[PDB]
Amino acid sequence: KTRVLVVGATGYIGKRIVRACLAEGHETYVLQRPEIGLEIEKVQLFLSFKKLGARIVEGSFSDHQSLVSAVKLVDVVVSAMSSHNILVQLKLVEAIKEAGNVKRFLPSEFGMDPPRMGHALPPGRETFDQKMEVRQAIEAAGIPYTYVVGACFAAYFAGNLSQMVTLLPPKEKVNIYGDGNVKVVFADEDDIAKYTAKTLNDPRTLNKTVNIRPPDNVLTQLELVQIWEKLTGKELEKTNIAAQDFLANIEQMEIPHQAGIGHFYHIFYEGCLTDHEVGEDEEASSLYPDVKYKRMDDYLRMFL
Amino acid sequence: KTRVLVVGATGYIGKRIVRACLAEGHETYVLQRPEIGLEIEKVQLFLSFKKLGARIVEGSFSDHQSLVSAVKLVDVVVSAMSSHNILVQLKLVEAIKEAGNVKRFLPSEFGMDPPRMGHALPPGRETFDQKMEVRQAIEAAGIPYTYVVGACFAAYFAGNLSQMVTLLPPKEKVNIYGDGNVKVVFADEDDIAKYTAKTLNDPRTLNKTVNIRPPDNVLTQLELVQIWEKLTGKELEKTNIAAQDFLANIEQMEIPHQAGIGHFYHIFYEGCLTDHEVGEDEEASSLYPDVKYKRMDDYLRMFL
């Protein structure tokens, strides 16, 4: 019981959500679009889904009632859209509204909490406003909701030691942002997918914002580096980077990777993932203690 | 106890060859070049090799010594490059020649036997030129070899029912090439990978061409369609497409769509994978009957 439709199942986090829902025990439906047809590694991905028991539902964002058709089948929709890919979610929102059977929607939120980013930095701000547009469509339709926020994906922030331009630990030299004493929240993407699978039929998170702040994984950038140093037995030579040398030459001197560099600043310089605090009734590791979340020392071991 | 380096592991057949080596029991080294510490799905491929026991080897084609080093850790280097990808092999073959320690090399050919392609014309021809340009460079260095040819990947030619323009079964209509009585070879790509992992170490094939031609998988597109409509229960509205109409106006289409049109013609009209016969000393399924390779029935069943 609890039939779940996943839209965005070809995305980085959406792979993981489908497999987390299958293993949690939901009836997991996966929307198939004119996806591939065209691209090989997304058919095989979908084939791998059905070999585990996912049910394929064809639909298009161009075809409004194909979307109503997907969502008639389930109790809960989960979106993981990783062009304007966040704002296409509004085509789905009114599909859910026309259908009316939906007991919950979880929009594509799996990073910084958007209503806390009112004075974010252009162009980075576009993300949070586009996501806030979708919330409003939801709440204006009276669609019950859950928003999963709070944690940097370990692959994009923890395995590269928070460097940019690489997704792997460095070989001798590492940049520290500011003094390196600002605390960031890291979470293995698998554990975000599992927390997502557990919260969607949980009565205690209906119409609420769930934070993913696993206590062992609340780290300053400098502690994270030290973890890597201890696994390896080698210090890295470290250059501290002052705030204004961090946004140096953003101007339009990089393609809108400018959005990423700005999100990085809010996290690593201002500490927006940690500048407030959350209760046990709204944080994921307290709500689902059965989930043994991968600590960042274990994440990093995968790279030795 | 056979050591194998796999170059091109991020590629389509590359992935499985890495995985088929490990399942057969060789010490499987995988070249990791700078290109991959980018694009998550390549780092997360590579660390899922690590979880399966592969050993990561760093190097660059632009650093001839780094390939020299890798090629010394190993008894056999396999290449599987799915443009520039075919003749960059040449600067590996020099790293293997200057090496001297490598008992077998397998260049990237898992398509059609190139010295039979004296008849195609540009632009389809070029990859055959490049493929034998790297063979002439292998036989010239005297590096012992094995070329592995003669099968359509089931994902590209079977599961789409040999329609171009998609990789999924057609919902109502199909195009039959010719009267559709030209029979070609279909191999599950997993099967092409495990064959290569077993002929790697085997004295029978050293310095010979081994053909992947499963007996029960030599079919024309017509019965392969009928296979699908057995499994499905519906008849597909066939439309035969005559050889001249199929290449009508090819010179006025984009010059990779030419290549694909030429490619499909050699297979489904000229019979390039059938125009020939092969015995048992030379045909993978007979040298390795411990494979219960997948027939296009069971393969196409994955889609229903």
Residue numbers in the entry:
A (entry chain B), B (entry chain C): 9 to 90, 96 to 317
From the paper:
Pinoresinol/lariciresinol reductase (PLR), an NADPH-dependent reductase, converts pinoresinol to lariciresinol and subsequently to secoisolariciresinol. Here, we present crystal structures of IiPLR1 from Isatis indigotica and pinoresinol reductases (PrRs) AtPrR1 and AtPrR2 from Arabidopsis thaliana, in the apo, substrate-bound and product-bound states. The crystal structures were captured in the apo, substrate-bound and/or product-bound forms. We found that, for all 16 structures we solved, each enzyme adopts a similar head-to-tail dimer conformation, strongly suggesting that each PLR/PrR functions as a homodimer, consistent with the literature that TpPLR1 exists as a dimeric entity in solution. β4 loop covers the top of the pocket, and residue 98 from the loop governs catalytic specificity.
Intriguingly, the β4 loop is well defined in the AtPrR1_NAP structure but disordered in the AtPrR1/2_apo structures.
